[model samples]
Target: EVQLVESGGGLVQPGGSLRLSCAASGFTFSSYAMSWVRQAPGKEREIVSAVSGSGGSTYYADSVKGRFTISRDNSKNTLYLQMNSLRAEDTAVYYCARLKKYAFDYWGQGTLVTVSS
Candidate 1:
């Protein structure tokens, strides 16, 4: 019954910020890492960032080096992604994924965030 449900996506003007969330269940949240990935209009999905469930470790893609923050609340079994300084180029369908053996195993339904004026 492992699952990851995500929310918090919507319209936003350029230069704004956004926060997305994912709640995990049926497993020990603090024992598995989670990651954020997105698929632009017609492009393939790309990893935006990830956070270690045990804490104190994170990785970010070069494209979003300083624009994204990935964190988690072990007690709530929830993961989060905070997007800063958004732009049209950031518009995409974002998905939260669970990492096992260095690859994505479980994925959220995805939340679409549109960036524009």
Candidate 2:
């Protein structure tokens, strides 16, 4: 019954930083890996990274380097994801998910963030 609930919305200007949250409930935060996915407008979703409360993380396909970061506040059972250097191309709905074996099994409701002028 683990679930991810996300917050934040609307357009953002270039170079501005946005903060979004993913609150998890009904599961032990230290027992599984959580991930962030980005869906550019009409495009399919892309994996950003996977993070474990145990302090381990893994990036997907390309090395995102430092443009994205994932952290958690165990006190609140919440995971935080931040992306910097936002461009218009970065407009999309960001989702927080949990890994089940080799794939995402639980997903957030999603937060739409449009990066524009």
Candidate 3:
């Protein structure tokens, strides 16, 4: 009965940064992993990060490599995404999900967002 809840869409300009969060409940969070996927329709789906709670290591996608960070708090059942040095093209709807088969089974509802300026 675990589920994820994503934060709302917002604006982040070039050189700006934003911290997005997703909270989980009703399940054993620390035994598994969490992921963030970003997309803008035509653009290829990009993986922002996949963090393993047990291993405590993150694999970042090429696009967001070094531009973002991933962390989790099992005690609170929360996942965090922090991105900085943003550009207009970096905008997308960030969907939080529980890792499964390189994709996800539990994707939080999200709003498509694009940054201009």
Candidate 4:
């Protein structure tokens, strides 16, 4: 059984730095890639980025680069995703997903990080 447990929650003020984590258990982290997805309130979901322990990363359809980064810690079998310069629109549930051939097959429970002051 594979699982991705996430961390962090609550309201993060605008211009604040937020860190979220996703730790995988019962599986080999290096064998699969991890991805980040963002879902704004009442909006459809979007793929933020996808990163592999061995193969590097790929961004979404748009090229609004640098605002997000994805990395993995092979030592802990965990994948970390981070974003900065948050606006009120950044408030949403962020999920860490495991990549499948066509799509992401496994997902974390998700951590809702609200950006507000």
Best by TM-score: 1
Give the per-residue lDDT of model 4 (tens digit) for 35-92: 6656556655544456655456555313336665554566675755555555667566
Clashes of each: 0, 0, 0, 0
Ten-residue stretch with the least lDDT total in model 4:
55-64
Ranking by lDDT: 1, 3, 2, 4
Model 1 stretches astray by more than 4 angstroms = 52-57, 102-104
Worst 10 residues of 2 by lDDT: 54-63
Pick the lDDT winner.
1
| Cα RMSD of predicted structure 1 | 3.0
- Across 61-102, the per-residue lDDT of candidate 3 in tens digits comes to 456667777655667666666665557775666666676444
- Candidate that beats the other on lDDT, 2 or 3, i.e. the better one: 3
Q: What Cα-based lDDT does every candidate model obtain? A: 0.63, 0.59, 0.61, 0.58
Q: TM-score of the candidate numbered 2?
A: 0.71
For 22-81, candidate 2 gives per-residue lDDT tens digits of 677656444566666566567556544457544465543134457655645566767655
Off by over 4 Å in 3: 28-31, 75-77, 100-104, 111-116
* TM-score of model 1 (CA atoms): 0.72
Best-first order by TM-score: 1, 2, 3, 4
Screening candidate 4 with a backbone cut-off below 3 angstroms (N, C-alpha, C), the clashing residue pairs are: none
